[PDB]
Symmetry: D2
Amino acid sequence: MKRIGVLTSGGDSPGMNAAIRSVVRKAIYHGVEVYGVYHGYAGLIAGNIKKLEVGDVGDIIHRGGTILYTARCPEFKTEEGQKKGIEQLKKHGIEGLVVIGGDGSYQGAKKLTEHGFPCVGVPGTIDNDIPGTDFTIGFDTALNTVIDAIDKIRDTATSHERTYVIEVMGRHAGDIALWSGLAGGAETILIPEADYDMNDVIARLKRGHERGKKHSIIIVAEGVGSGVDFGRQIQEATGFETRVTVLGHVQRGGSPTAFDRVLASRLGARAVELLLEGKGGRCVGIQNNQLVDHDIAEALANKHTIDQRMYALSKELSI
Amino acid sequence: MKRIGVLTSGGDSPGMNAAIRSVVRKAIYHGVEVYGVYHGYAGLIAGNIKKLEVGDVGDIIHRGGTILYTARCPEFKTEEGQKKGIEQLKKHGIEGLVVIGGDGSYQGAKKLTEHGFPCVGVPGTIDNDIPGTDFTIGFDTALNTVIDAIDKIRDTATSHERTYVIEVMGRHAGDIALWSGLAGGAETILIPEADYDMNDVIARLKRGHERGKKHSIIIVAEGVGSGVDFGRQIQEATGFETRVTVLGHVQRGGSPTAFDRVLASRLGARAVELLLEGKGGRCVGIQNNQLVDHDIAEALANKHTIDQRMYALSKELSI
Amino acid sequence: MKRIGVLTSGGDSPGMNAAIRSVVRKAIYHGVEVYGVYHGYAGLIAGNIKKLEVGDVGDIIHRGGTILYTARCPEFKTEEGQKKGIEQLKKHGIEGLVVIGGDGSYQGAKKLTEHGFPCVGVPGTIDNDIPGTDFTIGFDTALNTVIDAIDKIRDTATSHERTYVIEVMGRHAGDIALWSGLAGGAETILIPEADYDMNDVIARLKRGHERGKKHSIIIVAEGVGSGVDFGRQIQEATGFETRVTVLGHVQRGGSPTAFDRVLASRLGARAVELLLEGKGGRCVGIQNNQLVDHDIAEALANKHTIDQRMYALSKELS
Amino acid sequence: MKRIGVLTSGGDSPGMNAAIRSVVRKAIYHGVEVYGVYHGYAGLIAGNIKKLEVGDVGDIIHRGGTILYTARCPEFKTEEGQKKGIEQLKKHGIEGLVVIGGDGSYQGAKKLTEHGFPCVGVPGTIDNDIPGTDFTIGFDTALNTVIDAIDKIRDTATSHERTYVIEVMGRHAGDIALWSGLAGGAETILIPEADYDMNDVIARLKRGHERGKKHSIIIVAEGVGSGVDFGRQIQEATGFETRVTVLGHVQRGGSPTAFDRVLASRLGARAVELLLEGKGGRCVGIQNNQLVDHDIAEALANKHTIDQRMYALSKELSI
Ligand SMILES: [Ca+2]
Ligand SMILES: [Ca+2]
Ligand SMILES: [Ca+2]
Ligand SMILES: [Ca+2]
Ligand SMILES: [Ca+2]
């Protein structure tokens, strides 16, 4: 190619900027131009397009959020919109698009490709729920946000001999809960991919009160339920005073961790390589510590999973 | 005195350990023993008393929470209680007591003195309302916790052109909301100590939407209302997508910042000096960058106030 | 006034952009325009100047460094240089100037006022080495940078039963060393403002070793000497495994802490107020937890001093 | 096996405690006793061995360093030192040893296995320089200490238009440097696994300055040389203003990142599993995102490599 475009869609995620930065610096290394599309697919329909310069990506690698913004777009679900997007792309002479994000911001990469516009997906979310890759951009940072919260709430929990339900993000995926709860010494972790028995949680807790334990932390993925209801169930059942904490959107922001920066630079650069060598309708990622690329069509079919041996581990480490 | 005691009551607070460390290591310098009372006044009543050694304050200057724990004590409000508690004191040959915390807890230090046990209070809470001091131990730390949070939500707010309501702590004091909302560039701060008008707030938001500001962030002290409510009021009015975040108890934990560690080391040492100088029924504090001790009785009558000129400042800097 | 300017001079400092943000939003409140001068005094001479919009003050409140940059200017230390400064000032209709920084930024604020140009100065340095104020914009953030490091070095020193020496910045002031070491539970602090005896230090570490203490952190202010040297004198003297860390300019950077963001916001806002009230040749600051302003020339006249009791406290707590 | 021991040798590393917690809690899950061996190998020889109880691990997951300490041991390469090692082991009824540490530690773990005593080795070092694993416990944390430093030096370098050289740790491995440099946005990265030409460095540095760039970060792995020199060199080569930061041992400390806590917890638990299945002489690890174990002698045979394509990418991204 000679010119390509880049875009972010779906939720904000720490590292997208590093991802974006990479798309650009790489294309430059190959004599290619990059045009930033703003406000995601909404921005694409709208014509929100402006060339990015070597200097528009200088000093953003550390920066959370996405400089190109992001927004939902019902219109892009229709042939109608898909059509107008390509016009606007064609208008600026853009022959290739790197789509960075999650929430089937891939559907669009696919749709686009099917209309014969070359398109590559980069995994962008905090909740690890994108196929084609073991980890997504933003997950590592989001975890350190969660366990930093876990570290703090343990300070009070220990001081006051109290039990906390912390509700983490992960709308469908229990990744955050699994990983963070493992890392915070969480003595109960409740995920969507694994059965739980509330009567079991209650007993375990009672059991520790005896064996000298007065504080306790219960990580709960939002995809399982509302922390508020869970806490209710526990205090009502144990008489222990039981606080509840919903971390919510703090999880979505922050300076991306070293893992998230490297991953974003690698992936985003891979995505460019694919466009340039003619490929399209693909999504890159990291699998088994290796760079991979896949057909979006194929990847969107792979049901998401969590490492069950780890969930097991955490139960063992926390009887 | 040759032997004294130390205890922490009311809510947890980052820096208390630094206070306790300082209470202990200062006493040692003067050849005085120090005994820890565990689990607040409940502990005192109970007899939870163990000498502290040099090696028990060997960390702990960086650690949040309180190694002496803390717990409520209905029983200590009744006379029979403090009595029982003084017995315990006498039983271990303790001649004085440093009471670190809110909230409070100065009440007990007072009644203790009245019963002829020499008692010194130290300002420990995150919300900042303990009289006899411009700032309480834990404040600076909590503020940096809230701004870390404000920073992260600004990251997502900006990418999505969304408006956030963030509910912070301070059940009766607007200190946190004021100081952090200033440090966080929050365009709206609501505190118990100053009139607010929601029509003004709403208009202000609609105004900026035009001006070109697509994201805004409202800071709200819990002592004013429920964030998950103000948010509803705003969006059920303006057409704006409004998200809400209650940070809750993450605010209570954490490694105390430099200001808090230094403040704790100072107040702690001062508190021990009072006891040794034979004085009692006092409480220490920082006032106009100078340390002061006041009669608890008087201190307890001074309504808590916030710097109205700063609140004002935050308004001017905001429109 | 209808138009002022702002610049940043001397070593950059966390929370300057907070100070800048404040200078600019505050002026906009009173219907006043702000022109930014880039690259400190060198930029003023060269007329590197651009209207700041609302726009460019962010949010940048969390950002370290200075969006206006900074650079040394030997030339401005001379009559003709200032002539160019004013020429440029007037060429843009800038009626007043807010100067943010340290290490002689104030010098220019005075000279400029002397030549009949209203200037307010704002304390901006990590080392806290600026009169007319208890704390300078950048100090709190620096201290927290230093203790994070001390905490980390405490982790490794503890595991290995080793003794470290950490050299912190400060220039001529020992504020950082005294405040951080005290916050970090250091067992030795060495500063310009207090006197020490190496033999004291030595024996004091040899003694702590007697009571079974297996690790120590000595904190040394650069203004007192090289951390490397102290490490050496000590290891030769005792035989203990002694390492030395020079944190360096790490202390200069980072997102400014809540205190630094607030101080900058207050100070900056107060600085513009002064110009608007026709006041000039003043520097803002915070003293005894109250906002104050002083005539520069006389503020610059006080030798800086540390809190002697606190140093004494830090010893008793060892 | 009813009783095993655990120890930490080599340089200390954030997450060792997490690794200990896991060794000690996993064993309890299986009704095995754990005996701590303090001060690494010098301790093993001298006895200095104490039962680890639940309480001894119930609050260390978040803590840097090693609660078991670590010390060098010249004695333990001799035959007699080892003779002494085993006696002491047999004296406490320790049927097996988990060695958590760095490289030299693996040596002794083999010698023990040879002399009829089952050992498992756990990768513990910040410099990633240990075979039988892609990453070592400590790496992630160290990287993040490095990038935060880099971030902070970016602030001052950008306001002053300075060029910086930052010396990072890694005796013979360029992993920290390469990885943090990529993460940080280094314009220049120097490491032992890959040839560099100083002149191409100066040239690459001059081309960038002529292309407008006013500030630049340069990362040097301590194994390549001394930061102060590369500083002198390029200062007098370019004339630019140039500063030198040596981070030194800060990299060694700090609360372990989510990744290091998780890795530590999986690896440590796996190490217990091995000894319990009668599989001595091994070292655990993560390779291609999968848990693995390898004969110690064999792993110790593999010269350590970095990812050349990654070093390549870092170059392309900074043109
Ligand atoms: Ca950011
Ligand atoms: Ca902080
Ligand atoms: Ca910054
Ligand atoms: Ca730690
Ligand atoms: Ca796996």
